[PDB]
Design a protein around this nucleic acid. Sequence first.
DNA 1: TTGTGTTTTATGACGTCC
DNA 2: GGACGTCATAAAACACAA
Length: 66
Amino acid sequence: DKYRVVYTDHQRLELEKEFHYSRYITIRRKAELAATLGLSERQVKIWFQNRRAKERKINKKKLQQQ
DNA sequence: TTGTGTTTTATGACGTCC
DNA sequence: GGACGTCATAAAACACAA
């Protein structure tokens, strides 16, 4: 049992650089990237799902209004 | 330190789509 | 179908005032 794993900065770099392109992932690029960053398509799926919840959580607060 | 507060992987529940 | 989307949540991993 291994609950979690941290991702190399290079994996986090590329992953993040795609989020900038689209907050959503084509099954092509899901798999195209999965392979070039050596990670399960299911992973690149959840990372993008999670990444959005961050932008959502930042953006909510960036509504400081005050 | 350290303890405590936030950030990063990850899963299951349930929902939407022609 | 059957792929993905949101979630509430858990726990490893990290950051950093006292």
